[PDB]
Amino acid sequence: MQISANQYFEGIYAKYQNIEDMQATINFTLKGLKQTGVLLYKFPDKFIINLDSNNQVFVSDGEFLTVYVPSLGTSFNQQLLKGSSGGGLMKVLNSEYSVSYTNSPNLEDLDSSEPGKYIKLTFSRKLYKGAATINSFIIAFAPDGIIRRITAFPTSGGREIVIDLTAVKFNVGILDSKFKYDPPKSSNKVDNFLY
Numbered sequence: 001m002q003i004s005a006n007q008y009f010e011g012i013y014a015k016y017q018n019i020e021d022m023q024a025t026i027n028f029t030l031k032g033l034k035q036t037g038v039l040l041y042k043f044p045d046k047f048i049i050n051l052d053s054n055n056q057v058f059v060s061d062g063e064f065l066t067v068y069v070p071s072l073g074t075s076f077n078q079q080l081l082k083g084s085s086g087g088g089l090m091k092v093l094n095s096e097y098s099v100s101y102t103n104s105p106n107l108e109d110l111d112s113s114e115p116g117k118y119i120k121l122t123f124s125r126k127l128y129k130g131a132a133t134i135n136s137f138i139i140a141f142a143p144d145g146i147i148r149r150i151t152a153f154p155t156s157g158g159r160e161i162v163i164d165l166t167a168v169k170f171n172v173g174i175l176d177s178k179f180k181y182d183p184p185k186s187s188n189k190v191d192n193f194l195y
């Protein structure tokens with residue numbers, strides 16, 4: 001009912017404040033390649049991605065993104081979003097970016113401003129909170145606040161990172177001991193090998 005982008009995002013933010021975890025089929029593009037697997041997100045700020053097409057594993061504690069390369073016996077980590085104060089996707093969007101409707105307040109196609117089923121929000125970095133390696137996101141929401149696509153625009157001007165989430169399910173269960181989300185002691189720090 002004439003809802004502004006900020007009001008719409010308040011509802012999204014509040015929804016995700018009351019969810020314990022998320023499982024999703026994930027497709028994402030990095031370094032010119034499509035990766036495909038399963039995302040498990042432990043709110044507010046932890047996740048693991050197990051890939052289908054190779055044995056690599058991506059883990060984030062909200063500060064570092066670690067990539068395990070088991071065929072080599074080691075792992076590599078970079079900052080998830082250098083410049084950010086972290087705290088998970090929603091906190092970052094809510095505190096370090098200003099939100100607007102990408103095209104309109106109306107329901108649109110994922111790809112165009114034609115009619116479709118999605119609300120699309122643009123998050124533009126507040127540079128008075130510091131520069132970051134990602135200066136904007138465009139996020140498409142399906143009608144129950146479910147994320148369908150996150151497009152991340154590197155500040156470098158490199159290729160956009162397109163993240164497609166499907167088969168989204170909430171509160172599947174992830175025992176707190178199951179997973180270690182920070183880089184292991186043996187991990188190798190690398191500057192920005194992904195974005």
Ligand SMILES: CCCCCCCCCCCCCCCCCC(=O)O
Pocket residue numbers: 028039041045047058062063080081086087088089092150152161163
């Ligand atoms: C809820 C969906 C998030 C999953 C994104 C992982 C995709 C792998 C490539 C990463 C590039 C994008 C960085 C996004 C930063 C998000 C901040 C956070 O989740 O704490």
